[PDB]
Amino acid sequence: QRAAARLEAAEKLGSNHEAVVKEAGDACFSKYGYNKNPGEAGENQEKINKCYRDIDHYMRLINYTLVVGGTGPLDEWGIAGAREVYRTLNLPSAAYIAAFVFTRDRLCAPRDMSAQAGVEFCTALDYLINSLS
Ligand SMILES: *[C@@H](C)[C@H]1/C(=C/c2[nH]c(/C=C3N=C(/C=C4\NC(=O)C(CC)=C4C)C(C)=C\3CCC(=O)O)c(CCC(=O)O)c2C)NC(=O)[C@@H]1C
Numbered sequence: 254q255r256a257a258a259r260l261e262a263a264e265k266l267g268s269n270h271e272a273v274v275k276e277a278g279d280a281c282f283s284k285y286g287y288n289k290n291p292g293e294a295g296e297n298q299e300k301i302n303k304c305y306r307d308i309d310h311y312m313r314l315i316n317y318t319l320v321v322g323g324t325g326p327l328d329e330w331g332i333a334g335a336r337e338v339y340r341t342l343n344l345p346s347a348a349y350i351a352a353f354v355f356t357r358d359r360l361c362a363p364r365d366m367s368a369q370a371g372v373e374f375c376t377a378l379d380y381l382i383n384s385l386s
C-alpha cells in the first residue's frame with residue numbers, strides 16, 4: 254500500500270551505490286579541491302581513500318532507512334555524534350554536504366528509478382543535508 258515507493262528506491266540504490274557513492278566523491282572534491290592540498294582532509298591517499306568510506310556509509314544507512322520505513326537506522330548510526338567528532342578531526346561539514354546535493358541532483362524517474370520512489374530517495378539525502386548544518 255505504501256512500501257513499494259520506498260522499497261524500489263532502496264533496492265535500486267542497493268544494486269548501484271559504488272557508482273553513486275564514488276560519483277558523489279569526485280564531485281565532493283570538485284567543490285573543495287583544496288582538501289587535496291598537503292595537510293588537508295584528503296591530502297593523501299589514505300585520508301582521501303577512507304573519506305570515500307564515509308560516503309558509502311551515509312548511503313549504506315539509507316538502504317536500511319527506506320526498508321524499515323523511516324530514518325531509524327540512519328539516525329543513531331549516523332546523525333549526531335558523528336558530526337561533532339568531525340570537529341575533533343577537523344573534517345568540514347560543508348564537505349560532507351557536497352556529496353549529498355550532487356547525489357540528490359542526479360536522480361531521474363524514467364531513467365534511474367521512479368517518480369514517487371525518487372522524491373523519497375531525496376527525502377533521506379535532504380534529511381541528512383539538514384542534519385549536517
Ligand atoms: C535528469 C536528472 C538528468 C539526467 C541524468 C543522467 N544520469 C546519468 C548517469 C548517472 N547518474 C546516476 C545516478 C543514479 N544511478 C542509480 O542507479 C541511482 C540510484 C541510487 C541514481 C540516482 C549515475 C550513478 C550515473 C552513471 C551510470 C549510469 O549511466 O546509469 C546520465 C549519463 C550522462 C552523465 O553521466 O552525465 C544522465 C543523462 N540527464 C539530464 O541532463 C537531466 C536533466
Ligand SMILES: *[C@@H](C)[C@H]1/C(=C/c2[nH]c(/C=C3N=C(/C=C4\NC(=O)C(CC)=C4C)C(C)=C\3CCC(=O)O)c(CCC(=O)O)c2C)NC(=O)[C@@H]1C
Binds near residue numbers: 294295
Ligand atoms: C569526505 C567526505 C571527508 C573525509 C572523511 C574522513 N573520514 C575520517 C574519519 C571518520 N569518519 C567516520 C565516519 C563514520 N565512522 C563510523 O563509525 C560511522 C557511523 C557508524 C561513520 C559514517 C568516523 C567515525 C571517523 C573516525 C575514526 C576512525 O579512524 O575510524 C577520516 C580520517 C581521520 C583522521 O583523524 O585522520 C577521513 C579522511 N575527508 C575529507 O576529505 C572530507 C572532508
